[PDB]
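Components:
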Amino acid sequence: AEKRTLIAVIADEDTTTGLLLAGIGQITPETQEKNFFVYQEGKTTKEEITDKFNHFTEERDDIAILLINQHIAENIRARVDSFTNAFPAILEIPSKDHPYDPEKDSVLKRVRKLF
Amino acid sequence: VFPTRMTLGLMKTKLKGANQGYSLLKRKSEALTKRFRDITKRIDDAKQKMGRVMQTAAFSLAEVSYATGENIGYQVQESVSTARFKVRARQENVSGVYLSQFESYIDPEINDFRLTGLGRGGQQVQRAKEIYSRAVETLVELASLQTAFIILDEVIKVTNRRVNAIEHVIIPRTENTIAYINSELDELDREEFYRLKKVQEKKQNETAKL
Amino acid sequence: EGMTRKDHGDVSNQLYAKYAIGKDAAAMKAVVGEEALSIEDKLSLEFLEKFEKTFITQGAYEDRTVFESLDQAWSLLRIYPKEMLNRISPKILDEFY
Amino acid sequence: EGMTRKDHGDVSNQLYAKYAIGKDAAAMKAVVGEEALSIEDKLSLEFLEKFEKTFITQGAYEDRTVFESLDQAWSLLRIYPKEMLNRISPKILDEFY
Amino acid sequence: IVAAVSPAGGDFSDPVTTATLGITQVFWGLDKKLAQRKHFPSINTSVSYSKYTNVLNKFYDSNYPEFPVLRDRMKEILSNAEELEQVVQLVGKSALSDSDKITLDVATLIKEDFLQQNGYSTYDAFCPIWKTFDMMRAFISYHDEAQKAVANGANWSKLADSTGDVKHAVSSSKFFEPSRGEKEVHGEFEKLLSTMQERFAESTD
Amino acid sequence: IVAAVSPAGGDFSDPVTTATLGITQVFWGLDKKLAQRKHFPSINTSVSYSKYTNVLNKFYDSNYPEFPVLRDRMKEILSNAEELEQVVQLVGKSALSDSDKITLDVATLIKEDFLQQNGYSTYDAFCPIWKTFDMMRAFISYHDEAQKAVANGANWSKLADSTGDVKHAVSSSKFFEPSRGEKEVHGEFEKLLSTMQERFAESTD
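Structure:
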């Protein structure tokens, strides 16, 4: 059933600038807040990513697919590991300026156990 | 206290139904395990390809933004107030369960915004969004399978638990109750015929004597 | 010998295995669905209905022999490929395919 | 006539079929869980507990007329829609539900 | 000779019911669980049998018989509805095919219009052989039209919504009695085929 | 007259147990699985009943006792403990909530404290209805405080660890002699209401 068409993006200013340039999300006027989180290396707090991820994952039921980087999700892996619901779905991708690793996937760890 | 008569006929249909449901749950658990394995490989392959494809577009957008000479992400983030590429929720029955699917829809409401007006410098900002707009579709279509893979991985534990519990708890109560009910009904049925035959033999032996 | 062929047991073994696989695929097809069934389960499910309505089905005054039942089993087993039958020899399988 | 309505057995047949559907939905939902139960099975399961704890619960010296028992059975029977019941006529069911 | 039987020996498989069922030639099912849902008499298609159907099919088929073709598909639809109902509650439903759902929906309407009866009325307890054969032929033609339309590509809700008033008129045509025309056949059954053909053609596309 | 019955071959369908249980008005239960835990005879509501329990609870509950409310709620929780254990064994503990786990722990604590008659230090002494009324009121207050505390936000391990010495002190209450400060109310059971209120107040915030 169609109950969401919003796409969330959790990445740096370059990936969020390119994804916002091509178009994956926007700012909805019904909530009065943006649908993306701009992250900075050594500039933003670690609690803001967990608050934006918890507010986008638990305080909103209109997001279809929410992307999150493994580097920004590494500091919030405790709060991101507690979420297992597919509404909205969480897809772990490699962050820019870092190497890809399959061990940083939260869905791959629970999906690997009891396959 | 328990019912002795008419219990094996009632327990036989539950034993046959559990015997068919155990094989059906085993086959559905095997197909869900194979689909969970194929989705487990395709999620890693699409995650790696979406990771490299996102890293190439992020490197090209960072090279275009660094080659421009200004913060295009600040005006691009404030100038964005609507999305162009969206998704539609739909239920897809695959392997006997409801999976989450995403269908990409292109609407002509969110076009390129007038935020590049530096003359020749707007061409790299236009080409970067022109490359990222085609680059985002492979990341969305590759990332759409995670909702179905999480649902299959969530259903595989319940199918694996029900396939073991339904096969474990089904047979022994109806088998022991049916065997005890038939074992008591056999001697309980034979005892009246033995007492009637002994009464008829005692009546014939008493009638034969004087 | 002289009234029945030697491939009656080999064709009856593959026909019984295809009938059991069609009987399992018929009940598993409803639980699995039309878009989640196996490739051999569809041909075995069609071979169960075709073999059930072609080999089991017969009139009250319709006489049959071992050659007619062996030709009907080879005609009903002709829908399956050569790589799905291993309970018969290659000469009798390729000769009466 | 004059001491009971004509629609007494019609609500009793739908109440007995709803009680048997609630017992079969509870027995089928007891083994596997909340997967084999339908929308009518949950309404029959809640109607079996509400009817078993509402109509069966009474005093030892209390008395009631047939109109109060038919009104309580008609009020307790309003837990399922009219599109999933077939043990009563539509004329008597449309007038009193 | 119509004689009722009931087991009293302490089991359903006693020698009295086995000898009475073995010596008999006609089978008429009756279940206490199926009778509680307002479907008395609930006959069983697996335990029902008739030996005089071949001899009666010559004279009855000689006059106007179509009972055999809709009767075999009705018994196969009842057995498929019982197998799907037992496999659905046994295994647990998380999805349903349109072919089994159409056979279960046709078996529910055939069990409601055919199994549902009473012994105190004439409107819903009296039906002629030509009207019952036309209703069973209309239900078998609707089941074959739904199965043929489902194979060409269509949904179950689009097939039921494509049928619409045809199943409501065929299901609602069991409460009337013969009071029109100059014979047992009525004009309401012949007009349902033309609307059923257009509803089957519109339900497919 | 209190006479116990036993089977002739291991089954309870004999005429001695059926005639003695049918002719009698009060029944005493017995669990084979509960007897392995040293809780024989253990039965709350599933294998025993009493017709004179209403007049006995009304006559003895007039001045001194309040046994009817805690006996009704304890009989309802003991009746729901079998369905909670069967649903937890069949489906699992993921579908169950914290109220079924708190009622399952209260049924195991009340069944172990009431059904258990063999001690570990000495034989059990006499206990009146006033002594068991404090344990049933402490178990009903602990189950009501545990069930009401989980509604406002509270962990099950924090409340089960917040109980602590109440379960160990409630188990050793039957080994001590009666009349340790009062005949109807005891001083040991009074601290469990204040400790359950302090643990319920600390578990909420």
